[PDB]
Design a protein around this ligand. Structure first.
Ligand SMILES: [Br-]
Ligand SMILES: [Br-]
Ligand SMILES: [Br-]
Ligand SMILES: [Br-]
Ligand SMILES: [Br-]
Lengths: 223, 242, 295, 300, 48, 267, 49, 135, 213, 236
RNA sequence: CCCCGAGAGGGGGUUUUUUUUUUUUUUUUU
């Protein structure tokens, strides 16, 4: 869980970030609230334009799924009723997969969730709570539950998991499970053991994120 | 390595012209009165180009309307039968064609007085019937003639020309065979000036030869301007005399 | 040529107080005293031409009149136009210029006229008066900054057109005059819009009273239920001869039209007037007729 | 689309500053921005930075079959899709816009068409199997000079990239992993570098068309603000061999021919410094990877 | 859920195999008010 | 349709055309065509070419190019490509006319494809490219006249090598200069307008707007042939028609077509 | 919402949890997993394919 | 997105092993009396593989429809029959020589694989892995 | 290949293999997604056809203003037999002309009626074929429009005989569309009679379906 | 070191105390709970302030959201029938400036402002679900309260925090260190726009470069040195 | 500013494509 992030790296965007976990590096940008296109307009709430760009090649249907899952996480996080008939552009440029993209998209999705959240924080957009996402995998023979698995570990995995939780009260109370994307062969006992260990590492991540956010933003503000 | 005499020791080319001779240049004004406000049929060598200027007129969509200037649009239709070998696919959305259309617009935006036609649209439709080298230069001459026929105000003529560079020998007005055998430079000269509206080099050219090539092109473009101006005054006299 | 006249040609894409002609970029004068008008542009003392046309000098106003260009609406012109669109409290009508002309709701005569009380439902029911496609007479009331025209039909002379057929000629062939509505032999009436838009209809009572319950039906699409074939065949003939005059670049006037109409009587079938050689000769006969009648 | 509103005051100020030999960033009219090149862990990963302008290029390749027309040549494509990340002025996926198609065509004529990459050396077995090299440019942050930044990003990437070594047994392709044997670099025939000039008319159009003395201002490598207020653009591509790879002045402000020639000669001094700079950063990157390989084997 | 398998396939009738059909397998499924029609076709590729 | 007319103008035109003595707005008779101009052999790059100009400014350009193909794998030996200026390639009008024209000029329907055969294996594929610069009505008949003119002035390369690829199998080689004129019988496509109980040949723009229906009738070898299609010239005044009108239209074409061909057959 | 791909064997191949509204409790998950098995057993054996 | 999720979940649940798509290619020869016969190998040079495509038309949508697409796809996959494939014994078409600038090269002979009009083998699906959808 | 679909590997090549008068089935209103729908299945000799029609309208048209409604018809290829896009466009145009003579457009100002016909399953069992599908399309569209509640002047039906297709209304007295490909010479009268017989049968079954079902 | 707060965290103040909610703080319409939605420093006004305590969160942002009683710098980008269409920030929703929102206004005479002009104005209405409005006068007196056109000069982009400190904080040395180098007039907008104009362009340019760099570093005890090297560099 | 009205009223100032004469010893100075 030795992640590293930077905040406010882009000039022509309201907010930006760069999240890195092992070899997975994703840069994200957020502009909003701004004027929306007519087809995007929502009478009462904020409209989200979510874009995911791959590390190699052009955006395909694969990234279209990454956009959809990332939408399921960011939508309830943002206090959308504060911005009626308005738009918020959220763009994720995956710079380095950190995994075999021909087989997995686990680490890229988690890194996009964490980066998007950080970019939303930087942009100063109304959020109902905080959030953290981690990738989890289950190995073949050992059947151990490895949090933040490497690319080599994924190759020999039986199941891959993306867990993103919604935290409140100083990152101590799990408000809800924003996204759980479990793929592969697994049983009910493995699922809750995954959720128990997953919640712990997620809570540790929020604490680390809270540290990063305060370290970067506080110099900008005044005492 | 070319087995054909691109430039013989006698100073003669494959078509018979010398190094500094333009192809057969024949212009034609008011060719499609019932189809456009201005029209021109260009024959520069084997090149055959129909140019139609429609406007200034009401935009079809109020969303696309400028209250300070006219909207200038150019669409080049390179037909599938323009070359010897018929192209299977269309060129309508070809990136090469989009650049050509964009290029032509960027040329005449600074020549056509769009500011005196606010809230209007000028649509320029082009049909290339036959192609044989220097198609870009011929496109420029076709638009300039057609725009003038439409009575649309502009500051000056824009003449187009292409110049090839066979090793050390410059060749004015290149055909398809010469373009396939050497690098060419396309020029867009404004009026009788030395100012270039369009400088286009797509193949390798030594830095030392470029200035001389430009000098040849500008001189040749001035002759194209004279031919365009000549044919235009001729048509003017035949119409004003009735 | 019993059924179709097909002219053929091979090996060719197509057939192939002095007025000073100038082209774009050409230097017209170097006298800085001049006031530069349309068709020109200047830099210090030098005045250049922006279009291809003839140099015009009116007083101290130097301008270049283009050889070609769309109809330019002057204030007070009698034009014929078609409603292009209807919005808010105005119509936009196609005259044939660079821009659509506007026709405010307050610039027309509502049905029932002076007796009618003002209603706020008129602005929501404009389509019951003038809708898309309708033809009408109108006068260029005013001009906008760019040159656009504001129209009005505040007269019995102006209004929706019916009982006839539409045709158009280049606006250059129709000039301004004291009046553009004319009565012609055959009980038909022509409306020669300055914009080149022409309306040929059956002569109405108004057309007769011009030289010698109805206010509710001034916007009806319905035509005269009793229109004889002799009037219809007259309209067709007047239409063809007008197109013939236009084909020869001959300026259309009320005299030229009637003259051509009677001269075209040589040809039995009216459809004979659509052929090129017939059109050219009819126009040529008019010019030569004016030659030996003028001298 | 979404427009950038520029006040009359800003338009008049930036232009008047040019009339007083001043540009906002403090550069000179003939001064190119300092180009910073950063290589990632993987080969083909390169990040180019020019002031605030940030672009990232990624070189990748995969086994593919050559076209019927060219059985001896491999495949090579360059992607430069824009995104709202570089600014809300850009529409997502807008690959038909005027500026987009131009930029796409400049890069293509500078790298692809110019034959900067040896596509013949991308062939494994003639008319059957070959390498398909892909250059993906990612526009992160826009402050002008996207063409110049991309051309450097693509070239630096291609020269830094290394493809897996291959031994051939007839038609059986044995693709050696990086663990077994070392990867093989690409073949570069020449190193094309783009330099973009921006033109400004300090006076009016009349004095540009019929004016005696020329007074049009030309600056090298314009920022976003300077780019939005220019009247004409010129992109010239050269290499250390003193040859013009391509020149593109697609319309815009009419410019004197001798001035355009001056720009080409000025650009040549810049592309020389840039090319040598790229080569040096590649050497040091190679020395860094070798020094770590020695410290990894010694500790092993 | 109501389904019908292999009704669109060329191997529908083992006695009368269709000649101008390239469907290897199929399934027509209706659940409630929604209808789903699936057909499987095939291709062949050389392996190296 | 194309032309925009008011309700009054349409009513006047309809009554005038639906009259028992049918009155055309230009004074024509129900079988008279408007004057056209035709240019041929102006594209040296192509094997054949034509350009037709109507009286209303309607203009169409046809080009004819050839290509040697294996007729054992290439079923269609004549491909028509239609491009209407101002319309998308996938427009409804474009594809319909394209599909229609390809049926009119099929290999074994209205065209002697024997004249395209070179050897026992190879034949000449003919590409008929249509470019409609301007048109104010259904250009199907306009294009047809141009294709006719173009195909009657087309010159193809002449074969030199033997014509038996089954045995000796010689590579198709052609003479360096001589070209044989393409002897073929191009079909014609006539379009009719139905206004009330009257049938008009060569419908004008204003006429088509008020028409109740229309007919597209092909013509080849001195007789009526498929494709025959009823067509709505407009979409606001389309009505069903009595069968006798359909038989009247076929009869009308059957007697006036040779007159058109005669004026068109002049070299 | 909860989406499940359950194999009749008793194991699971896909489990999507999207909690944007009410809180997803372990009881809700367990009940969903139970119903997914019951549904899977029905769909697999019904049409004897 | 539905197309992707269907594609991925088939790969993740491990329904279709690559071995189950391997083409056991036979050989068609010209026997006596002028007839063609095909000989297929069993339980044992060029190698081919089957590729499966799917078209899923959804009519009368009333809500989330992924689950219906998956269950339909599962039912369809259990009915898939793979056609027998064979090549001609000695097809005349051999290598194609292509010349370079002085040196010569030969493009490998491409064998035209043909599917049997009648004979077919059932798809080998890991029935233990077939899951069904519910939301 | 395509960035919006999964078309698989490019080196893959499609599998090529070696070597009463009519039976009808009609159903309406089974698609809740739209306003009107119909299922038309026909089986005869060595060719069966199962096509589905769907009517969407009257819905909004945000452009200018129109006193009457605007009809659009689009044919889509099904699973089995494919057709040229041009040929499907041509039939669409032919169908538009027919229903612009039947649909009471005056009752739907500034509205759009979009009619879709899915050529779902067209089997060719013979161990321009589009001409034999045309009468079934008209039957489906007529059923769907009537099921949608769109006003019709009369039940439009059709018939096919030797490549000739002709659609009738008003008890076969008048013709709303005429189509002819290939066929023979001077066979117009025979085709009209044979098609009117099919038109009459189809119309009876359609009315029987719209009523009893 | 400061007291940072994050979204979802518990709100310190008790419901028993009447609290006026400012930026960053959100009152849920459904559950009636008061909760922070922005990330930054929580500021709570001292008690005794007329019995009402004002609590808000100072958070970093650069995208302006119109609020009533704000001095902003807009640019005229359009002219409607009764008002101007004005942009306060790129890509943001346009704001309206009425023709009657000027001193000495009349239905007969429209203002002479042309498209492309800079205007210093006050936000009069800022409804969340409606186009905001600005005015260039005092609604009560009718005079111009320093509002109106900004002739020439140069405009500067700046984050909302830097602009707010420049307008409300007198301890901000920026205006002082610039006055120690040259004479200049300045308009400050809460929408993150700063207008600067001197007698000579070189001085305005020098001011532009200083404000840009000072906004970038955000180190107060470095403004004087930045201004020093900037005005020096212009002299070269 | 412009239009309209015997009486400071009203209407407007426009929203990927013309690229292929094939043969028997290292190194250095000649
Ligand atoms: Br106008
Ligand atoms: Br090659
Ligand atoms: Br700058
Ligand atoms: Br005949
Ligand atoms: Br794929």
């Amino acid at each position: 869980m030795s992640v590293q992030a930077e905040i406010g790296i882009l000039d022509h965007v309201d907010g930006s970030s760069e999240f890195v976990s092992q070899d997975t590096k994703v840069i994200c940008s957020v502009t909003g609230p701004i004027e929306p296109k007519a087809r995007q307009e929502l009478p009462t709430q904020l409209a989200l334009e979510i874009i995911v760009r791959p590390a190699k090649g052009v955006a395909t249907t694969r990234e279209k799924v990454l956009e959809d899952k990332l939408r399921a996480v960011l939508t309830p996080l943002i206090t959308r009723h504060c911005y009626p008939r308005q738009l918020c552009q959220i763009t994720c440029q995956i710079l380095e997969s950190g995994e075999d993209e021909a087989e997995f998209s686990l680490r890229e999705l988690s890194c996009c969730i964490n980066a998007a959240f950080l970019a939303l924080v930087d942009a100063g957009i109304a959020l109902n709570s905080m959030c953290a996402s981690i990738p989890i995998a289950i190995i073949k023979d050992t059947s151990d539950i490895i949090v933040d698995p490497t690319a080599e570990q994924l190759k020999i995995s039986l199941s891959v998991h993306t867990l993103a939780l919604e935290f409140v009260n100083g990152g101590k109370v799990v408000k809800n499970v924003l996204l759980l994307d479990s793929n592969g062969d697994f049983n009910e006992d493995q699922l809750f053991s995954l959720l128990e260990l997953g919640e712990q590492k997620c809570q540790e991540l929020v604490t680390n994120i809270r540290r990063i956010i305060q370290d970067n933003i506080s110099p900008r503000l005044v005492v | 390595m070319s087995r054909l005499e691109i430039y013989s020791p006698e100073g003669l080319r494959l078509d018979g012209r010398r190094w500094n001779e333009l192809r057969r240049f024949e212009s034609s004004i008011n060719t499609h009165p019932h189809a456009a406000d201005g029209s021109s049929y260009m024959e520069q060598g084997n090149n055959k180009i129909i140019t139609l200027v429609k406007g200034p007129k009401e935009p079809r969509l109020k969303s696309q309307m400028d209250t300070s200037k006219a909207l200038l649009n150019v669409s080049v239709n390179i037909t599938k039968f323009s070359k010897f070998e018929r192209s299977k696919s269309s060129h309508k959305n070809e990136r090469r064609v989009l650049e050509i259309q964009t290029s032509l617009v960027r040329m005449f935006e600074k020549n056509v007085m769009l500011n005196i036609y606010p809230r209007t649209v000028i649509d320029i439709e082009i049909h290339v019937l036959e192609q044989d080298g220097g198609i870009m230069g011929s496109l420029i001459n076709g638009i300039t003639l057609a725009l003038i026929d439409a009575g649309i105000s502009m500051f000056d003529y824009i003449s187009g020309i292409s110049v090839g560079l066979y090793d050390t020998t410059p060749l004015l007005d290149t055909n398809s065979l010469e373009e396939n055998a050497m690098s060419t430079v396309t020029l867009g000269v404004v009026g009788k000036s030395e100012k270039l509206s369009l400088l286009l080099v797509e193949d390798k050219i030594p830095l030392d030869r470029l200035e001389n090539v430009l000098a040849i092109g500008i001189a040749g473009a001035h002759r194209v301007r004279d031919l365009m101006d000549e044919e235009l005054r001729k048509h003017a006299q035949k119409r004003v005399s009735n | 040529s019993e059924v179709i006249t097909i002219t053929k040609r091979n090996g060719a894409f197509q057939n192939s107080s002095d007025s000073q002609i100038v082209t774009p970029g050409e230097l017209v004068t170097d006298d800085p005293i001049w006031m530069r008008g349309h068709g020109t542009y200047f830099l210090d003392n030098m005045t250049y031409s922006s279009v291809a046309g003839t140099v015009s000098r009116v007083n101290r106003l130097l301008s270049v009149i283009p050889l070609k260009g769309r109809y330019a609406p002057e204030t007070g012109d009698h034009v014929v136009g078609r409603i292009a669109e209807v919005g808010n409290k105005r119509w936009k009508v196609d005259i044939g210029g660079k821009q659509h002309a506007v026709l405010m709701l307050g610039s027309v005569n509502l049905p029932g006229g002076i007796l009618r009380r003002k209603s706020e439902s008129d602005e929501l029911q404009m389509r019951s008066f003038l809708k898309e496609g309708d033809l009408l007479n109108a006068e260029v009331q005013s001009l906008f900054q760019d040159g656009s025209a504001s129209l009005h039909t505040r007269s019995l002379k102006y209004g929706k057109l019916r009982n006839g057929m539409f045709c158009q000629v280049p606006s250059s062939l129709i000039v301004r005059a004291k009046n553009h509505t004319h009565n012609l032999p055959g009980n038909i009436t022509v409306v020669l819009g300055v914009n080149g838009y022409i309306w040929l209809r059956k002569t109405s009572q108004m057309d007769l009273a011009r030289d010698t319950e109805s206010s509710w039906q001034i916007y009806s699409d319905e035509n005269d239920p009793s229109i004889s074939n002799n009037i219809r065949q007259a309209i067709c003939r007047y239409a063809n001869v007008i197109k013939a005059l236009a084909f020869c670049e001959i300026g259309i006037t009320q005299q030229r039209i009637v003259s051509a109409y009677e001269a075209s009587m040589v040809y039995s079938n009216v459809g004979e007037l659509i052929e090129k050689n017939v059109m050219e000769s009819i126009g040529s006969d008019i010019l030569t007729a004016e030659k030996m009648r003028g001298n | 689309a979404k427009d950038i509103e520029i006040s009359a005051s800003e338009s008049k100020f930036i232009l008047e500053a040019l009339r007083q030999n001043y540009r906002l960033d403090g550069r000179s009219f003939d001064q190119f921005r300092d180009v910073e090149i950063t290589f990632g862990k993987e080969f083909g990963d390169v990040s180019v930075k020019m002031g605030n302008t940030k672009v990232h290029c990624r070189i990748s390749c995969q086994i593919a079959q050559p076209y019927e027309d060219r059985p001896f040549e491999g495949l090579f494509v360059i992607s430069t899709e824009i995104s709202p990340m570089a600014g809300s002025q850009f529409e997502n996926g807008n690959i038909t816009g005027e500026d987009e198609v131009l930029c796409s065509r400049i890069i293509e004529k500078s790298v692809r068409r110019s034959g900067a990459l040896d596509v013949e050396g991308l062939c494994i077995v003639a008319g059957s199997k070959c390498w398909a090299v892909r250059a993906d440019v990612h526009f992160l942050d826009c402050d002008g000079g996207f063409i110049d930044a991309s051309c450097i990003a693509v070239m630096a990437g291609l020269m830094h990239f290394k493809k897996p070594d291959i031994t051939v047994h007839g038609e059986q392709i044995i693709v050696h992993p990086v663990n077994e044997r070392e990867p093989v670099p690409l073949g570069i025939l020449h190193i094309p570098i783009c330099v973009t000039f921006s033109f400004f008319n300090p006076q009016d159009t009349e004095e540009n068309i019929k004016g005696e003395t020329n007074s049009e201002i030309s600056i090298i490598d314009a920022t976003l603000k300077e780019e939005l207020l220019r009247d004409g653009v010129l992109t010239v591509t050269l290499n250390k061999n003193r040859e013009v790879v391509q020149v593109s002045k697609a319309g815009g402000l009419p410019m004197d021919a001798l001035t355009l020639m001056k720009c080409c000669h000025e650009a040549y001094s810049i592309i020389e410094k840039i090319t040598d700079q790229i080569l040096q950063l590649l050497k040091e990157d190679s020395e860094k990877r070798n020094k770590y390989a020695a410290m990894l084997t010694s500790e092993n | 859920v109501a389904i019908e398998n292999n009704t669109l396939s060329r191997y529908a009738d083992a006695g009368n195999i269709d000649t101008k059909n390239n469907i290897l397998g199929s399934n027509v499924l209706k659940s409630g008010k929604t209808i789903v029609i699936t057909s499987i076709t095939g291709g062949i590729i050389e392996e190296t | 349709g194309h032309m925009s007319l008011s309700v009054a103008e349409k009513s006047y035109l309809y009554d005038s055309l639906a009259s028992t003595p049918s009155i055309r707005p230009d004074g024509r008779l129900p079988h008279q065509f408007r004057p056209i101009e035709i240019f041929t052999d102006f594209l040296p790059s192509s094997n054949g070419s034509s350009r037709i100009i109507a009286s209303d400014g309607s203009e169409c350009i046809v080009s004819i190019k050839s290509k040697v193909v294996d007729h054992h794998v290439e079923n269609e030996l004549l491909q028509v490509d239609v491009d209407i200026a101002g319309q998308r390639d996938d427009a409804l009008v474009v594809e319909t006319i394209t599909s229609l024209l390809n049926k009119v000029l099929k290999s074994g329907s209205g065209v002697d494809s024997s004249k395209l055969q070179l050897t026992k294996k190879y034949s000449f594929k003919i590409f008929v490219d249509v470019l409609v610069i301007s048109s104010h009505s259904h250009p199907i008949s306009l294009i047809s006249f141009a294709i006719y003119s173009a195909l009657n002035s087309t010159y193809l390369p002449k074969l030199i090598s033997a014509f038996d690829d089954l045995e000796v199998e010689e590579l198709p080689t052609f003479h360096d200069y001589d070209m044989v004129k393409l002897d073929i019988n191009p079909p014609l496509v006539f379009i009719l307008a139905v206004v009330g109980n009257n049938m008009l040949l060569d419908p004008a723009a204003n006429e088509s707007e008020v028409a109740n229906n229309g007919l597209i009738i092909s013509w080849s070898n001195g007789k009526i042939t498929s494709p025959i299609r009823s067509v709505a010239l407009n979409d606001s005044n389309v009505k069903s028609f009595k069968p006798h009108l359909l038989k009247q239209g076929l009869a009308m074409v059957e007697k006036y077509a040779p007159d058109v061909v005669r004026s068109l057959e002049n070299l | 919402t909860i989406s499940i791909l359950a194999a009749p064997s008793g194991n699971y191949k896909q489990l999507t949890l999207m909690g944007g509204g009410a809180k997803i409790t372990p009881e809700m998950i367990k009940r969903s997993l139970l119903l997914s098995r019951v549904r899977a057993d029905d769909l697999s054996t019904r049409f004897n394919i | 997105t539905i197309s992707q999720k269907l594609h991925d979940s088939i790969l993740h649940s491990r329904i279709l092993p690559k071995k189950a798509l391997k083409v056991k290619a036979g050989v068609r020869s010209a026997n006596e009396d002028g007839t063609f016969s095909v000989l297929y190998p069993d339980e044992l040079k060029r190698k081919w593989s089957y590729v499966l495509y799917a078209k899923i038309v959804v009519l009368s949508r009333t809500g989330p429809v992924f689950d219906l697409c998956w269950n339909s796809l599962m039912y369809a996959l259990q009915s898939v029959k793979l056609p027998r494939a064979f090549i001609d014994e000695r097809a005349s078409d051999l290598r194609m020589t292509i010349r370079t600038r002085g040196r010569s090269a030969t493009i490998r002979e491409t064998y035209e694989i043909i599917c049997d009009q009648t004979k077919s083998v059932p798809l080998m699906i890991n029935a233990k892995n077939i899951a069904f959808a519910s939301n | 290949q395509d960035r919006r679909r999964l078309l698989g590997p490019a080196a893959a090549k499609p599998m090529a293999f070696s070597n009463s008068e009519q039976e009808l089935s009609l159903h309406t209103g089974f698609i809740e997604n739209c306003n009107g729908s119909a299922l038309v299945e026909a089986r005869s000799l060595g060719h069966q056809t199962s096509l589905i029609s769907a009517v969407y309208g009257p819905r909004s048209i945000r452009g200018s203003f129109t006193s009457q409604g605007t009809i659009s018809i689009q044919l889509k290829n099904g699973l089995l037999e494919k057709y040229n896009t041009n040929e499907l466009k041509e039939v669409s145009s032919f169908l538009m002309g027919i229903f612009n003579s039947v649909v009471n457009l005056s009752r739907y100002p500034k509205s759009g009626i979009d009619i879709f016909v899915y050529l779902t399953y067209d089997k060719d069992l013979t161990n321009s074929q589009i001409s034999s599908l045309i009468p079934h399309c008209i039957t489906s569209i007529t059923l769907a429009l009537a099921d949608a509640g769109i006003e019709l002047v009369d039940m439009a039906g059709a018939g096919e005989a030797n490549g000739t297709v002709v659609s009738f209304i008003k008890n076969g007295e008048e013709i709303v569309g005429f189509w002819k490909d290939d066929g023979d010479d001077e066979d117009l009268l025979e085709c009209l009679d044979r098609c009117k017989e099919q038109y009459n049968r189809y119309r009876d079954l359609m009315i029987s379906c719209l009523m009893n079902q | 070191m400061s007291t940072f707060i994050f979204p979802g965290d518990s709100f310190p103040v008790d419901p028993t105390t009447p609290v006026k909610l400012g930026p960053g703080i959100y009152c849920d319409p459904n559950t009636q709970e008061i909760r922070p939605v922005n990330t930054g420093v929580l500021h709570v006004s001292a008690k005794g302030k007329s019995g009402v305590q004002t609590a808000y969160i100072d958070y970093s942002s650069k995208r302006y959201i119109p609020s009533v009683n704000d001095f902003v710098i807009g640019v005229i980008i359009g002219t409607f029938s009764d008002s101007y269409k004005v942009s306060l920030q790129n890509f943001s929703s346009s704001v309206s400036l009425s023709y009657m929102a000027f001193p000495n206004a009349s239905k007969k005479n429209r203002p002479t402002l042309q498209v492309g002009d800079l205007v210093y104005a006050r936000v009069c209405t800022a409804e969340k679900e409606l186009e905001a409005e600005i005015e260039c006068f005092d609604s009560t007196t009718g005079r111009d309260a320093g509002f109106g056109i900004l002739e020439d000069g140069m405009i500067i982009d700046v984050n909302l925090n830097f602009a707010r400190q420049l307008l409300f904080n007198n301890d901000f040395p920026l205006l002082k260190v610039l006055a120690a180098h040259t004479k200049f007039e300045v308009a400050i907008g809460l929408n993150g726009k700063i207008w600067v104009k001197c007698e000579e362009l070189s001085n305005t340019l020098a001011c532009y470069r200083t404000i840009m760099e000072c906004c970038q570093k955000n180190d107060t005890a470095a403004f004087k040195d930045i201004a020093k090297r900037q005005f020096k560099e212009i002299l070269t």
